Structure formats: C-alpha cells, structure tokens
Amino acid sequence: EAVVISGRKLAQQIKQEVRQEVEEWVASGNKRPHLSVILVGENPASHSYVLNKTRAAAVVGINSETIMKPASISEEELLNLINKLNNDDNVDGLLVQLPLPEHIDERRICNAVSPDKDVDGFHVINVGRMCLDQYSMLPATPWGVWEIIKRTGIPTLGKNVVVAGRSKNVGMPIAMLLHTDGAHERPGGDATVTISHRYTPKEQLKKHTILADIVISAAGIPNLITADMIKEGAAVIDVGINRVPKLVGDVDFEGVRQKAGYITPVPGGVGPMTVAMLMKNTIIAAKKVL
Amino acid sequence: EAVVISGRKLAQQIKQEVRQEVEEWVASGNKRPHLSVILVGENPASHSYVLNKTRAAAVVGINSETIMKPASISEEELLNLINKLNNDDNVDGLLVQLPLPEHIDERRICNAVSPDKDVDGFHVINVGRMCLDQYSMLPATPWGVWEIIKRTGIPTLGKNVVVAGRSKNVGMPIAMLLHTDGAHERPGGDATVTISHRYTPKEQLKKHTILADIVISAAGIPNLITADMIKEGAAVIDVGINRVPKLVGDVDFEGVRQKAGYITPVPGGVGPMTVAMLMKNTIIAAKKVL
Ligand SMILES: NC(=O)c1ccc[n+]([C@@H]2O[C@H](COP(=O)([O-])OP(=O)(O)OC[C@H]3O[C@@H](n4cnc5c(N)ncnc54)[C@H](O)[C@@H]3O)[C@@H](O)[C@H]2O)c1
Ligand SMILES: NC(=O)c1ccc[n+]([C@@H]2O[C@H](COP(=O)([O-])OP(=O)(O)OC[C@H]3O[C@@H](n4cnc5c(N)ncnc54)[C@H](O)[C@@H]3O)[C@@H](O)[C@H]2O)c1
Ligand SMILES: Nc1ncnc(O)c1NC(=O)Nc1ccc(C(=O)N[C@@H](CCC(=O)O)C(=O)O)cc1
Ligand SMILES: Nc1ncnc(O)c1NC(=O)Nc1ccc(C(=O)N[C@@H](CCC(=O)O)C(=O)O)cc1
C-alpha cells in the first residue's frame, strides 16, 4: 500500500523554517517583510486560496494585505495600482491572484510586477531565466511539487516521469524542473519527462504512465489517473483541485492508493505546499538575493 | 522504404518566399534588410555555417556583413562591438555565432544583443516569450525542424514525439514547439512529447521511441537511433551533425531508412533549414513587427 504524503505536514515544517529565517532577518535590524496580494473579482476558490496565503504570512511573521477589487476594474487601473506597489519600498513581494477577467491581459499584468518583487515568478524574465536553468524566483506550485519529491527522497535522475497538463503556470514549469540538468545553476531533476495535455488520447497517456516512476497530474480532470495506468511502486503527485459539493484531485485516490508507492491527497497535498513555497519566495524577495 | 525528405528543396522554397517578401518590402520604399554576424575564432564548422548564412542572405536580397574576431578577444571587447551594432540603425539583425571561447560568458553575450535584433532568439526575453507561446523570434534550428514537419504534412496533434537532447538552443525549444497549443499566439504542434537526455538509460529511450510517431534526435551521438527503436512508418528527423573522414547525424541512416516512413539525411536535411529560417527571422526583424 502507498505511503500517503501529507503536503499539509510538509508545508507546516517549511513554514517553521521560514518563520525562523524571518525572525533572524528582523533581529538583524532589517524591515519586517511585507507581501501584497491583489484579488480581482469574487471567484470563491481564489478567495479561499488567497486567505490561506495571508494566514500563512501571519504564521511566519510576514506582514500582509489583500487588496480586493471588483471584476469590472480596467486593465489600466490594475496597472496603476501595480505601479504604486512597485514603488512602495515597504512592499517586498507583490502577486496578482489568477485568473483575471477576460478584459485584462494576464501577461501584461504579470510583466508589470517588478521582477524583484515577483514572488509568483510569472514575469517573463523569470520565466526565461527558469527555462535557461538560471537562478530565478520559482513559481510556487511547481516548486512545491519539486519539494514534495525531494524532501520525500523519491529519486528522479534517469527516472521516467509523466506530467499531465501543460499550463504555463503549473504543468510547463513542473516539466522544466524535472527534466533539466542537476549541474546547472538552478538544478533540475535529470528525469525523462513526457508532457501530455488535452489532445493526448487516453490510450497514449496510459501507455506512457505505465512506464513512469513518477506521475504528476495537473489537468483538472477527476479520475484522470486510475490504478491500471500506474506501475506499482510509482509515485503519484496530484496537482488537480476539482469541485465535484466536494473537492477531489485528478487521481482516483482510493484506487491508486492500492498500487502506487507514494501518493499525495487532495485536499492536504500540493495545495498547502503552494502556500509554503510562496512564503519562501517572499523572504527571498525581501532579502534582495536576485 | 522511407521517403527521404530533402532539406535542400524545402529550404529553397522558404528562401524563395523570403526573397519575394524582401523585394515587396524594398519596392515599398523601405531600407533593404541588413544582417550582421559576429564570428569568434577559427572553428572550421562555425566559419562554414556562417558562410552558408551570408550566402543565403545575399541570394534573398538581404545585405550582410560578417565581423570576424580572434578567439583571444575579451568579453568586454565583444560587448563593446555588440553595443555598437545595437545602436547602428542600418543593422536590423545581429547574431553571435556559437560556441564562444571558454573565457566568454555566452549567456551574458546573448543577453547583450538587443531583443529587437535578436534573430537567433537567444535573448532571455525571447526565450521567455517562446516558452509562454507568445509571438517571438524563434531559434532557427528548432523552427527548421518544425517547418520540415509541417511542410511534409506529417501530423502532430495527438501524436507521440520523442526528442533526444535538452540543450537550451536546440532540444528544449523543439520540445516546446511540438507539445504546445495550436490555438496560442505562436501555435504549437499539440503532440505528446518525451524529452530524453544524457541521463536517460538507453533501454528507457527505446521504450519511448518504439511508441513514437516522430523521433527527433538532437544529441550529437552517431548511431543513437537504430531501426529496432523505430516503429514502422514513423518520421525520424536527424538534427545531430557528427564529424565521423565524413559527416553523419544521430540516426543510422541506412538501417532506419528501411523501417521509417520518413527520414531526413545528414547533410542536406535540417542544416539548410536552419539557414533558411534565419532569413525569415531577419525580414521579421527588419519589419519591426515585434
Ligand atoms: N496548488 C495546487 O494544487 C494547485 C494550484 C493551482 C491550480 N491547481 C489545479 O491544477 C489543475 C490545473 O491547473 P492549471 O493552472 O494547469 O490550469 P489550466 O486549466 O490552465 O490547465 C489545464 C491543463 O489540463 C490539460 N488537460 C486537459 N485535459 C487533459 C487530459 N485529458 N489529459 C492530459 N492533460 C489534459 C490541458 O491541456 C491544460 O494543459 C486544476 O485542478 C487547477 O485548479 C492546483
Ligand atoms: N542545423 C543543424 O542541423 C544543427 C544546428 C545546431 C546544432 N546541431 C546539432 O545538435 C546536436 C546537439 O546540439 P546541442 O547544442 O544540443 O549540443 P549539446 O551537447 O549541448 O546537447 C546535446 C544533448 O545531447 C543529450 N544527450 C547526450 N547523450 C544522450 C543520450 N545518450 N540519449 C539522449 N540524449 C543524450 C545531452 O544531455 C544534451 O542535452 C549536435 O549534433 C549539434 O551539432 C544541428
Ligand atoms: N491561481 C494563482 N494565481 C497566482 N499565483 C498562484 O500561485 C496561483 N495558484 C494558487 O494560488 N494555487 C493554490 C491552490 C490551492 C491552495 C490551497 O490552499 N488548497 C487547499 C484547500 C483550500 C480550498 O480548496 O479551499 C488544499 O489543497 O488542501 C492555495 C493556492
Ligand atoms: N552555432 C550557432 N550559433 C548561433 N546561431 C545558430 O543557429 C547556431 N547553429 C547553427 O548555425 N547551426 C547550423 C548547422 C549546420 C548548418 C549547415 O549549413 N549544414 C549543412 C552543411 C554541413 C557541412 O557541409 O558542413 C547541412 O547539414 O546540409 C547551418 C547552421
């Protein structure tokens, strides 16, 4: 039977690490770090996630605020707010919760966040730097997936990995991190990585997962991954969070639990790890390391 | 037996398209496009490749100059030359031929070329834009592979693709182009893409290629791709160029020719396509579309 990895427990540990780093940063005479989160509209999942972020900030001693704005705001008004926060020396980290409304260009908005305060790692320079294996502010959810694997000791070098999903914010960075050189400035996982997506037929997906030592599902499709797709002993990391009213992942948890060696639950898996790696990025940003 | 795709004939068609585009541009009263190539040292293959590029430029109506510097040049002197070319309004395209001497930081050099003149697409902002599926100057060798596939009419949406190699200028952009969304600003091939590399066990490479509709070898290893690794009728695209006294690719050409449906030869395959796609990028740069 699979070990169930508690992302909640791993995230709490990481937050303890961040709290200590923050406290020693303040005791050294530095300003306490401050995180600003911009929330647009009323997507209730976005509100839940942002509340979890500001909770975690308080736990680790980082000052925070959520600035909530109606969906009817214009792009230029979002940009004006972002520009004010870019020039406010008290703000160390700035992020815009996604998705934004259709009349707002997410890419222009992400590129307007000063790259030094870009704790989500979505600015194009941070994307390019990550894709070149240079030091960069890593996006929180992919970095949380990497930390789950690394802190559990699941090996990656020479291993077969399948990622289901290719979104720029989640699946693509996860595939980048896992396949790239362990010896480069920002090390990668040196795994053999298959990228699948909405046009992979299920039979081709299965033919690739059945070879995989790690399967990472970030499609947002309930029961996309089932025990027959998984070779036994493999690690299955469930990035999906799907409203079905209850929350499930992409993985058939009880089925795959019988065959995988390791498995993450939804909720309590990747989700809390996302919030933890954002706290790590914020103290990194306050320290002006990059 | 396998169709042998002539990279020479496809490139000739692409180059004729560029010659028509450039002369319509010049007929409209615009400055003739101009490409500057910087060439460092005496790598015989580099000199050979640069001559192919400026020979192609002249035939399609693009003015060119190659600026040759000894390998003993320093990093500051190369940067000085690059800055002079960035500010010369006659120069539309600027590229530095790689590899550079060991004492030169290639990443610093590539980021010094202004992104609007970066016809190789090696600047971090162009790498980031490409990885976000945004309009960008695509690197010429990856774009050549893409064109070989599309112009032969080999389908990609939903097909399995294996790329052997992960280098930032060749293997990684190929994997990015092929797996990404057809509906995005810069369309992608919508394929299921496996990325293999130097830590992929040779047995594991076979188990993925035997599933592959398209194998793309960009590793620089003679005879890495052999007939037992290919399923009957798949397309095999040879990006490697290996000096073995002769030139060969990564594929066992004679053997794989008996099982593949399509195959590219070395020489005369991807190489002339690299030169051709650079001409496309140069007229794009002259038009300042981006
Ligand atoms: N911390 C977390 O766990 C966390 C954070 C953010 C988002 N998510 C969740 O991850 C899932 C998607 O995240 P995202 O940002 O990538 O969203 P997205 O909608 O942009 O991504 C959807 C991805 O699903 C892929 N896909 C669709 N059908 C597929 C299929 N049948 N097989 C393989 N791939 C398929 C699509 O091609 C696309 O790449 C959702 O449940 C989302 O809520 C989780
Ligand atoms: N126009 C062209 O045809 C053209 C242009 C440029 C480069 N190339 C060729 O591309 C090949 C590689 O170019 P590069 O810049 O990527 O060089 P590189 O050595 O930096 O990259 C080669 C890749 O090979 C991978 N690799 C090594 N062993 C492997 C294995 N056993 N199985 C799978 N992958 C393995 C490495 O991890 C690396 O990512 C060379 O032949 C180069 O000359 C061709
Ligand atoms: N959209 C974005 N825009 C900008 N930057 C980002 O990083 C994101 N992405 C997220 O914020 N992703 C995220 C997903 C889940 C949680 C989370 O806390 N999950 C709990 C359950 C909570 C619940 O479901 O109520 C769990 O999984 O246990 C937190 C963040
Ligand atoms: N290094 C770089 N730095 C900066 N930007 C780049 O794009 C590169 N990469 C190349 O320039 N790659 C390249 C490889 C081969 C040819 C070529 O013309 N090949 C012919 C003849 C081979 C022969 O006879 O020697 C063939 O294969 O048919 C052209 C370009």
How far is ligand 2, taken at its centre, from the CA of residue B169, in Å?
10
Is A198 annotated to bind ligand? yes
- State the first-to-last Cα distance of chain B, in angstroms, to the nearest integer: 43
Atom of ligand 3 nearest to the CA of A120: 5
3-class secondary structure for chain A? CCEECCHHHHHHHHHHHHHHHHHHHHHCCCCCCEEEEEEECCCHHHHHHHHHHHHHHHHCCCEEEEEEECCCCCHHHHHHHHHHHHHCCCCCEEEECCCCCCCCCHHHHHHHCCHHHECCCCCHHHHHHHHCCCCCCCCHHHHHHHHHHHHHCCCCCCCEEEEECCCCCCHHHHHHHHHCCCCCCCCCCCCEEEEECCCCCHHHHHHHHCCCCEEEECCCCCCCECHHHCCCCCEEEECCCEECCCEECCECHHHHCCCCCEECCCCCCHHHHHHHHHHHHHHHHHCCCC
Interface test with chain B among A181, A185, A197, by most B beta carbons within 10 Å? A197
Asked if B142 and B177 touch (Cβ cutoff 8 Å), the reply is yes
DSSP characters over chain B: --EE--HHHHHHHHHHHHHHHHHHHHHTTPPPPEEEEEEES--HHHHHHHHHHHHHHHHTT-EEEEEEE-TT--HHHHHHHHHHHHT-TT--EEEE-SPPPTTS-HHHHHHHS-GGG-TT--SHHHHHHHHTT-S----HHHHHHHHHHHHTT---TT-EEEEE---TTTHHHHHHHHHS-TTSSS-----EEEEE-TTS-HHHHHHHHTT-SEEEE-S--TT-B-GGGS-TT-EEEE---EE---EE-SB-HHHHTTT-SEE--SSSSHHHHHHHHHHHHHHHHHHT--
Q: Which one of A137, A169, A195 would you mutate to disrupt binding with B, by most B Cβ within 10 Å of its Cβ?
A: A195
Residue B139: nearest ligand to its CA? 4
Experimental method: X-ray
Rounded to the nearest whole angstrom, what is the distance from the C-alpha of residue A130 to the centroid of ligand 2? Answer: 20
Residue A277 belongs to a domain with what CATH number? 3.40.50.10860
Of A166, A176, A170, give the one whose Cα is nearest residue A198: A166
Instruction: Tell me the ligand closest to B179's alpha carbon.
Output: 1
Is B51 flagged in the annotation as binding?
Answer: yes
Task: Say which of A124, A192, A200 has its CB closest to residue B128.
Answer: A124
| CB of A95 closer than 6 angstroms to any ligand 3 atom | yes
In order of B93, B129, B151, B170, B273, the CA distances from B144 in angstroms are 18, 18, 10, 10, 5
Counted residue by residue, chain A has a size of 290
The number of angstroms, rounded, from the C-alpha of A90 to the middle of its chain's C-alpha atoms is: 25
A250 is catalytic: no
The Cα A136–Cα A134 span in angstroms is: 6
Q: Is A200 on the interface with B (CB under 8 A)?
A: yes
The residue range of the domain holding A80 is: 3-131+272-287
- Nearest chain A residue to B179 by CA distance is A195
| CA B45 to ligand 4 centroid distance, Å | 8
Q: Which residues of A touch B168 (CB under 8 A)?
A: 131-133
Q: Which residues of A touch B201 (CB under 8 A)?
A: 158
